[PDB]
Amino acid sequence: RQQQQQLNHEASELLEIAHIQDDLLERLVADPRIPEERKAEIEEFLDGPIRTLTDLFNDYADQANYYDLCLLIFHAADFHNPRTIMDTWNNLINQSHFEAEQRREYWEIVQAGGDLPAGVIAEPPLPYVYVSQQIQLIAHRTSLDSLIFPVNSLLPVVCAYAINNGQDASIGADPCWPIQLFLNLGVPHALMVQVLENVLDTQEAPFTGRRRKLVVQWIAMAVDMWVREVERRGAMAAAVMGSWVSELLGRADQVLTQIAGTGATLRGGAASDAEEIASLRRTVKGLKRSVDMLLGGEMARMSFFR
């Protein structure tokens, strides 16, 4: 069995590298922004024996700014470097945002009569939709167990992008879209709330001032899903949550009381979000109630008939 596994493992690693190399070669040959003279040179060195991950990264993936394949390379190489990983995530998000904005612009010109730039093939997804498509494609290929998904660093970055680029209600997007994304991808509920707590305590920009209203809304949505999950898992077994989650919702209520007060005394006139915040207060209290009941004994009596 040992000799079998060692060969199955060598073939699995070399197959992972080979697919990366094939994805690169195909993309480079098809890229409009690559001169023909270079493409023939790329085809010579990549359509043959499998190359090392260093070369694939330095000589090709990094030169062409294929940041998604850079991340797959950091995964195949067991690359321990959080800072470079996050730099690559930041470049991939920004590159995709600019590409989505460009395609929506070209569209708006068609729907208005103008002419596109020469050699531009004529309702493309909003930028936050194309961005999260890129995150999904990588996650399914790396399985979320990778070091290219440090949720403690990657979730705040994605939330930062949503704020600093208005990927919120103004354009008709769900303001909780970053949370939906990582939950559906299979991030455990406890880890989400744990990170969101750290976002709220440290107050790193842009998560500052009255925009912590949005952080509280993410916490509300995450805890809500967590509660639903626990209730579902209890019914499941008929046929972890600590007091820290309750404390976190209390502080969240205090943040909302602070934001509303500051909003009422702003220069130029009171803030327009008065009832929007009052609603969030009710939701947060409802969640603290549910969490308090579960913590207080209703969680050990979930498999029992009522």
Partner: peptide, 17 residues
């Protein structure tokens, strides 16, 4: 085994020779 070396590469956007 990966080793990044931004120093000396080959200009991916220039022909050879």
């Amino acid at each position: 085994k990966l080793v990044i070396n931004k120093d000396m590469r080959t200009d991916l956007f220039s022909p050879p020779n």
